[PDB]
Design a protein around this ligand. Structure first.
Ligand code: 84I
Ligand code: 84I
Ligand code: ZN
Ligand code: ZN
Lengths: 261, 261
């Protein structure tokens, strides 16, 4: 139902999904007036990110993004509970405007954004259960800029022509997910927010890394042209483009940084 | 029945005001990739802006902004139809994040923004009737930044004390409203959009002047701190801050400019 364009687009999500009009919404613009250094923001540790190349992981077009399912043995160490991986996915723009990150920095969009979604597996037996509970989810966000070809991201992008339509699934060999993260992961922004898609649950601890990664113009164009929101047999196809939400009012929140300058 | 925060804030406007989820929504980011010079964009003429110093004009806090009523002999010449003034008002942020313009320029907010609202008096009898009709409205927008003290803006701001609470009203002696416009009004951005407040009708021809005006740090703080959304005897007062809408998606569309250089 919900979309990023037209009558069912983001200003209407709250009609069906009340949390979309509630507090603590994401994404946000990261800018100086709302940043505050917090020396207690110690480095995360990425455990079991190096997935075996002999195993395979399900890539699915869900009608809104492309998502890779991740195993629960993959987890973040360093939060106040263990958060185990559940899936990663992307947000992007379109061929004529490759500026589709969700978070912005000092008012500017990056080309795209990767989210790696984790859930509190100490407390909950699955991400769905966790998704509507306080600090149930932790998402890592990587800002993506147009730059050099990125062989690691291509381990995902080379399979897109196989998940072109809603409901389609493909298998991706395992690779080291840490290769999708930027330099100096110890430098990040941290804030309490929400899912950026319906149902917009305000249950996410966000970590946005300070530094972007690069993928090429050709890899952005492939991501921006490969996928459809609709099923393979739909007589009204809709391209999966511009699948990012506008930034949200801050509502008195600060964003805490692990870097001072 | 609508606010800029909490459950009745901007993501929920479309429930009771469907146009807020429709096409042509404002405000937008004015950025370089979407600007196009249009030599057809000739200077506007501001007629009847020099309000009789012998008349008085009603200033009201309406719960959403401070509004000054304007007379129908004040008008813009230079558009296809005459557009007669109805009211002016402002939008601003808060002292902790004093960047509350509605339009942005290359992703940047200005401190505040003045709107002078006009309606098509050639086609329609009053602004209420024009507001949901084709070619109905024209708004001039001035971007405001902190700098030197501005005596002309103080012709309004010196009355804020008298309109602290919702419902309150003051009378302002006429002065020359052209004094609120920036330098080189021939230089502007032009696009078709919407009201930025409910009912968000997509009936506004926008003119956003290229150059900002300045007000002092004290004047900006006064604007940010002087007013409440709530009635005087409301036991839970709410400050009138952050009364701007987030920027809207604007895809496959241009903003025309009267300047190239
Ligand atoms: C267009 O983007 C999406 O489709 C998407 C976005 C988010 S996001 N951008 O990280 O807030 C999540 S998080 C889903 C969390 C969750 C997992 C399991 C069960 C319920 C919820 C999931 C999806 Cl499928
Ligand atoms: C917080 O801002 C406001 O309160 C406000 C904003 C607009 S705006 N930002 O220019 O879209 C208009 S325009 C009112 C046009 C109109 C005239 C008569 C009857 C209905 C609407 C009016 C008001 Cl009262
Ligand atoms: Zn996401
Ligand atoms: Zn306005």
């Amino acid at each position: 139902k919900w979309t990023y364009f037209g009558p069912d687009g983001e200003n209407s999500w709250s009609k069906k999904y009340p949390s979309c009009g509630g507090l603590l919404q994401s994404p946000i613009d990261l800018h100086s007036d709302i940043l505050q250094y917090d020396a207690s923001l110690t480095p995360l540790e990425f455990q079991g990110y190096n997935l075996s190349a002999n195993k395979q992981f399900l890539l699915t077009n869900n009608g809104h993004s492309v998502k890779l399912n991740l195993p629960s043995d993959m987890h973040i160490q360093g939060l106040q509970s263990r958060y185990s991986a559940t899936q990663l996915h992307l947000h992007w723009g379109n061929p004529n405007d490759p500026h589709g990150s969700e978070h912005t920095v000092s008012g500017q969009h990056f080309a795209a954004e990767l989210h790696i979604v984790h859930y509190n597996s100490d407390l909950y037996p699955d991400a769905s259960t966790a998704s509507n509970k306080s600090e149930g989810l932790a998402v890592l966000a990587v800002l993506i800029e147009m730059g050099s070809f990125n062989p690691s991201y291509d381990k995902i992008f080379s399979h897109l022509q196989h998940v072109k339509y809603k409901g389609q699934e493909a298998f991706v060999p395992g690779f080291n997910i840490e290769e999708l993260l930027p330099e100096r992961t110890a430098e990040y922004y941290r804030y309490r927010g929400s899912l950026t898609t319906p149902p917009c649950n305000p249950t996410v601890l966000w970590t946005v890394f300070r530094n972007p990664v690069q993928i090429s113009q050709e890899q952005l164009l492939a991501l921006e042209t490969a996928l459809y929101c609709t099923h393979m047999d739909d007589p009204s196809p809709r391209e999966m483009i511009n699948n990012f939400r506008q930034v949200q009012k801050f509502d008195e929140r600060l964003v805490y940084t692990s870097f001072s300058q």
